[PDB]
Design a protein around this ligand. Structure first.
Ligand code: PLM
Ligand code: CL
Ligand code: CL
Length: 174
């Protein structure tokens, strides 16, 4: 019944980069293929005077043969015609860390409590996403209040992802 075409997904009306700035703790993640950020994931968003949004992120990543490292990542956002949809160029402070460019959508936020982010890296031929990821962020590292949690679950369902998240732990690893 429900529409899982990426082109159908609503995103945050009138998204305000300035209001979104500061520290966001990842509470939950839906992983893409070949997942990178594992846990202890914390993002820091900024906007400069030209209106350009950027971010940094810290988190544990586990490169194969199970060698744990705290990745330190950088992202810069190019605006599109939709104020809530961006192209995110990203890299690690270390050369060998994963680099790339992903769509970055702010699906919903109330700026001071919760945010839902979404990226489709590759479409299916029917317009659904073949390879997606999604973060749920909280301003409080101890989690969302119930009213926000309930809104977020609705958005997760609207993205056709609600069954596919895992919780992100924070335990000072970094
Ligand atoms: C999506 C992060 C929010 C802002 C932080 C962007 C700074 C670089 C983030 C790198 C994330 C790229 C990896 C996401 C997919 C994954 O973790 O498996
Ligand atoms: Cl609930
Ligand atoms: Cl579920």
């Amino acid at each position: 019944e429900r529409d899982c075409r990426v082109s159908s997904f609503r995103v945050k009306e009138n998204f305000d980069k300035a209001r979104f700035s500061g520290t966001w703790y990842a509470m939950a993640k839906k992983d893409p293929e070949g997942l990178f950020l594992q846990d202890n994931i914390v993002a820091e968003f900024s906007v400069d005077e030209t209106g350009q949004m950027s971010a940094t992120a810290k988190g544990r990543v586990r490169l194969l043969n199970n060698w744990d490292v705290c990745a330190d990542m950088v992202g810069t956002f190019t605006d599109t015609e939709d104020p809530a949809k961006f192209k995110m160029k990203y890299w690690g402070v270390a050369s060998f860390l994963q680099k790339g460019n992903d769509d970055h959508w702010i699906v919903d936020t109330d700026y001071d409590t919760y945010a839902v982010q979404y990226s489709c890296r590759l479409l299916n031929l029917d317009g659904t996403c073949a390879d997606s990821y999604s973060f749920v962020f909280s301003r409080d590292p101890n989690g969302l209040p119930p009213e926000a949690q309930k809104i977020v679950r609705q958005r997760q369902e609207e993205l056709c992802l609600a069954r596919q998240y895992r919780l992100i732990v924070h335990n000072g690893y970094c």
